[model samples]
Target: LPSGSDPAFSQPKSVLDAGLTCQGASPSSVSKPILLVPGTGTTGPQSFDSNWIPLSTQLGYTPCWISPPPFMLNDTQVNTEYMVNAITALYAGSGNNKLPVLTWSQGGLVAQWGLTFFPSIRSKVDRLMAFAPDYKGTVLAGPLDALAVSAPSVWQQTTGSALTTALRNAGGLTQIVPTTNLYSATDEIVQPQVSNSPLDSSYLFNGKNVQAQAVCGPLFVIDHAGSLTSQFSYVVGRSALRSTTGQARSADYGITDCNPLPANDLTPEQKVAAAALLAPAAAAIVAGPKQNCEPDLMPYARPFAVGKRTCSGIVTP
Candidate 1:
């Protein structure tokens, strides 16, 4: 089906309700809504309900999460369609505000795909703030090879995967909108987090791609999972949303926030809820029966493998 316009790609009510849920009420003109997208192997509630949801709410922004069906293990192409629907709904439901997007890990790639291919929704987004996003994909050597085949996203996120090349060729090598990318030098999940990293930071309009240590200094440690709950990610994300220029300045923070906790004023209930999700959320990782080798590109994605886009844009499975 044509990715964004295909009627078949229409998301079911159940998926929309469970996936892109707002924290308080249906989005209104009261405030611009913020969408928090989770990485691979985790759901929206698992990733944001505890920390970002409450933290952003306290900062006076309407927040929601887009957890694609089945915890985002599907092909990144297919999941992009799901996210496009979520983006459309959120934009319309929020009184047509062009809100910002905050993504982690695999979610970042999907956002790039959506923003690059779906011109219809580009005006719906204000800016993007990504935590540990792998724009160039990862190199799957040792960490999760066993599940690489079982999980298509794992394979697609590999360094220079077909999708990566496709996205790059489709002008994703440069940020399509205002953006911010925060990577950690010590991150094991994404190799070469800095210093010859594959992730691109060339923004078409505005933004910054920075290492955590660059702002928090050499002692601030950031791993893959750690970025999700890191105080730096939260603080920087908040600052980006507040930026009239759509860039988060490293000067906005100093070494004082190198600590892991993003917010200190959370009530005990919010803290417990956020802390409670840490373990089970880690359990979201799946390795079971499926293809024994990393799957090849989808038909639509295949064209981009060699640098091409079908029809008006890339189609989806």
Candidate 2:
């Protein structure tokens, strides 16, 4: 996990020997494989073993859940690069040039950076699905500014380093690939309304051949931490494709009973009042002229009330 240190990259044979288990999807024809990347402070089966188990069993799809390098937390660049190498290995091992990627939380940012920094991999990718990705930045661990720039967990700052920026501007978007964003209005970690925003520039779309898609829902059952295992696996297994546009619109499957706030002890009246007050503000914030990804741009203001309701998108059960 140290900066620019990847044992996996140096030892391709070791990775080949350490084979991964392919769950559902068929490999009779070596079809493009779907890669499942985990969030920060996570590793191996411990990261995805629980929730992904059921989803993979139900979907009949094959997913490669990445294992964090040794120094994942303290070092961001190395972590990102390690993941990119894993992706490269995945595509190469599968013998498929094009593959689909579905990333959750911090994984989403990793996926985005991979696509932006490595054009070869981006060009071969069929569809990119970001589930609650930290596109802009998140204000979770301490203040937003320092977290964005210094924290190894925040990719928006580090991934935007000279190397990534150059790659993003070069052929990342112009490559004409389908980018789909799936987010929950109630996501507790990285704000969906914020992370799901659209990037405005040449890198956004590749001529008319490429497309950008998003699916935002209000019923997510889990927070940023649990999304990959919970709803994310379900969406990938049951509904990975976009029915209307034929472009893959990552599903924003949510639970009706899930509450965005940690309010197991709140009274019904309190919850109702909080929901009522926040709902209208949520709608308005995401409804304006520059609502590309308003949720991502907005930073979390601290000293937030105990149960004051912070997210712009939420609804009472």
Candidate 3:
């Protein structure tokens, strides 16, 4: 018998009949179920086929794929609200208060919103892994919004209707929980160095506790559509494997830039997308106060010795 009540799978009528299955061994009995959230406009089962299918086979952990209605960078609030209800239902059905979450790209923002806006879920989430999360906003999304505002394409016309203005606020994700950032300095769409700036100082600030990981490799030169399948699967699966094994859970491992493997045959889109997701050591803004400034500030400006000073005027008595 299924242990928990199942969530009502809401999908487009065209995709309603698509068959999907979870593809992994039950977690080591003790661990909670893992949920994989897609970036945007993806149906749940389709997500499994695109990324989680291979990931599940590789990691052997049960995966719950989230199917969020189409949304854009500017409509995060609506996405979050819809996701909250679905997450709540899943939690209730699973009989577990907390579950681990893994979100990709824009989905990262949605996960953070779910964590904050839905207080009922506070104690329920164990750990969150953001794979190239657009936590601090991305140039791709910014342009998409511009396109939507200008002459909306058919895609923008259909998917754009659901977007809300409240979601356009960047850094909204960090306002919720301290989430781990799996960022690549080589990311093409977003400015890797500027992803997260001026670390939040408040205790309640979510990113204050962030365990950040930077990957070092050639920036993937694939486009958005190109990266949706195989390459994405490999990265997420590898990341989840590291996290589950406690290998990359700390600040040291998380922040270090691990060199990636050699390139494969990728389409132009894939190349672009891959480029967007490759991790690297992004320069971060230094925070906190300087207790001692002598070493960093004094060498050139120091006063010269009395005798050493050039005495051009009449010598003092």
Candidate 4:
């Protein structure tokens, strides 16, 4: 028989959904609300696909998306204000419980800034999960800034910038709330892959930092941008969020491996095509120097050493 086929085994719709109707909200039926924050150059829905809706719906939690004004060009402070506003709305409409945040790239910085600078915002967040966050900063920001780009968020993310320095001093990784970082070692955009980790002590806040390979093993070759949508990232992200709320029953979450592999029913021809597309990047990743830091920044300003390797043989700093 299909799981939950019996009437007695069927679960009810989430309380947030119920509340949308004439029925009153059921506190017992709701889990923590989730606020999705997008990265630079993307909106909330654009960053996280429709996949999130079903996942959160099945998990019985309300999901909210924040779209900051000025689109992707706004700096962290402006984005932080937008995030704070979303949180305020969710808190007031919901049961006033703390919300968990899932941030991508630049959104991670914005979320961290809001949590660190605003005491009220800090108390409102229960858990934070950052996907491919530009924590220590990315080298691309410097070139973008030099071009006279108006992307303040990008400028703020350059390694050793004033904003990033302040973020570090404000306890960058040593967050009081439970935090988790999920990053891709193959992410070419972020220099010193270890910056994706939450181990920068100068800022003082520490959290769990996990590479995609650590969660999904060698077959999952996700790049920086792919981290937001890869099957491996989704499963690991869900596990992290549930674990924070004591709702994770198993570490595996029934996802033993990533899909589209030989074992996952991809034909030989399909595999060849996949290899053709991924081989060059993989080869370059393995051939290059390990833990490649931005040449312009001081060594101390770069990401700290993390004892791990990507599936592609790239040593993660």
Candidate 5:
């Protein structure tokens, strides 16, 4: 049996029970609090509980979570509002010091939005570690475009869309902060080939990208969704979040042997079924949504430089 006292193997309670506070914690303190943000279709605790809780506690920091709207079904702008509120609450409760944010997938985008639009939020965040984020949007948006019309957040994640351009234009990646983006080369959901690179000079200030395979080598085969739960990811993620350099911390922490890969919860047949279900919508993936769902909150929801309108130019209060 795994030793209960071993920080490497010990399991901790969910973030909800961790009782993280931020009052006196600082960058120089061992008790700094970490806020784990979840991706689309998942809550903060649901996305991070298994891996972050024990890892963070063992590292001497209190771990907490910010659960965005259920399924992250709302627009990214609305989700940003929720994130701002959560950050405020966490900051007030935990000693009011700067906190580091670790986010996965869409949660990364939400965090970036908060950092970009809200100066106070930018000032309060110490570091940002993002896992498998679609920073440049994803090709899978080709399929999601037609099928998930009501999901503005999904549409905004499509490559070449207005939201993508607006975010880039607003210097979303250019913020003067330390940010590390970790991605898997074989990510199935985010399609690593198109979405994993760091922001180009036009959009970045001090962000860097790290590929999991590059550091762990051939044995690290963790996929997109599995990143949040994999031991390999946890080791690298912890190093990134805890480091002051704001760069890929993989070089400093070596994983000489391949850790056991997590089990694939979805079978091959299930994956094929899902692919088939979305095949019909794939044809419609080439274009952006004809209508915008939340224009009021997303001020950048307009005709983009790419010559396409963000939505139908509809304003929803």
Candidate 6:
């Protein structure tokens, strides 16, 4: 999979059939399912093939994933269709089982866009578990901006980008679905960890935000990519999905879940696989061309004023 590919899967038909690859597990009534969404500059499998996909399955979740427009280097709105379609189709495929949607990096933004626009999907979702989510966009955009010279994803993800503004405005800036976000103090990308007034705060407005160190202790370090597979992160996320209150709280994890390696020690193969899954995004960030100015919102994303109004006199666009 390359950096730029067709936004729609180039396969013969049905993005679901073509792109929504599963981890060969089944969702029983008791056991839930999870959908792994990839971040920028990586395929769905490339992003989580070694991380959440397997770990989630180990935790009894029937994991599924899709490579959104390949590397997810295209327009945010365009790539989101894949997110929308996966939520719909995956839910239906599981005999209408509500799924726990897990995301890595930009994939979190992509999933948020889907949840924002398609409110109907809310019922089918158990929770949105985000790893290093940049809900308010990121200040670190300029590094490709550290990294694209016009990649729609890069522009749209910059701090205060129009897409960020539009997403927050269209909705009540409330949780569309119960969400749990995991961010790390040492995150190399996606600036501002917990105390710094980070972008993860967007999830805090209506959801729960967990800084890995907050769960594991001050010296604990789960970096940007590390959030994808860190055991503590998985604990927070999985706990939220299973939570009756529909959120993950630091109180949920005591000594057992807080350990970075809560499960058995990583196998030699897991380490090899982790390397392949974790290295690409930062490399892409530094290597890809970056745009100084962010792109404007797509027309469909723009809210229109219809005569329809609520008792509050504001129309829900």
The list of candidate 3 runs beyond 4 A from truth reads 1-32, 45-48, 71-74, 140-178, 192-247, 250-317
TM-score between candidate 1 and the true structure = 0.82
Task: Give the distance in Å from residue 115's predicted Cα in candidate 4 to where it truly belongs.
Answer: 1.1
TM-scores of all candidate predictions against the true structure? 0.82, 0.54, 0.52, 0.65, 0.72, 0.80
User: What is the descending lDDT order?
Assistant: 1, 6, 5, 4, 2, 3
Query: How well is each residue in 158-234 modelled by candidate 6, as lDDT tens digits?
Result: 76566776776666245678887878877777776657343453354667877777656787766676676766766
**What lDDT would each prediction earn against the true structure?**
0.68, 0.42, 0.39, 0.54, 0.57, 0.67
RMSD, each candidate, Å?
4.7, 14.4, 18.8, 14.5, 11.2, 7.5
lDDT string, candidate 5, 69-144, tens digits: 4456556766666666556566665677777788778778777767766556666778887777776667666754
Candidate achieving higher lDDT, 2 or 5? 5
Error of 3 at 144 (Å): 4.7
| Better candidate by TM-score, 3 or 5 | 5
Candidate 4, residues 71-91: lDDT per residue as tens digits?
444445656666766665566
Worst 10 residues of 6 by lDDT: 1-10
Q: Which portions of model 5 show Cα errors greater than 4 Å?
A: 1-31, 148-150, 192-205, 218-220, 255-297, 300-307, 314-317
lDDT by residue (1-317, candidate 2, tens digit) is 01232223333545522433345432323344666665555543444444443344344446666555531332333445556665666677677566666655566556665654445565466666555555444444334324333333433323233222433443443323465554444455554243333442212342211111223243334445333433343443234543333243333344332334423232455334323332332343233212111111111111111222212432121
Which digits, one per residue and each the tens of the lDDT, describe model 1 over residues 1-317?
12354223545656655566677766433366788888877777777766777777888878877777667776777677767777788888877778788887888888888887777778788888887787777774335554444466766676656677777766675677788887787777776565523344212224487677767767677677666566667777777778887778766877777766544656777666654544653455544223444445555445556632322344334
- Evaluation by TM-score, superior candidate among 2 and 5: 5
What residue pairs are clashing in model 4?
A: 168-203, 171-203, 173-205, 173-206, 174-204, 174-205, 174-206, 175-205, 306-317
True-structure RMSD for candidate 3: 18.8
Show how many residue pairs clash in every candidate, following the order shown.
3, 11, 24, 9, 9, 11
Angstrom error of the Cα, residue 49, model 2: value is: 1.8
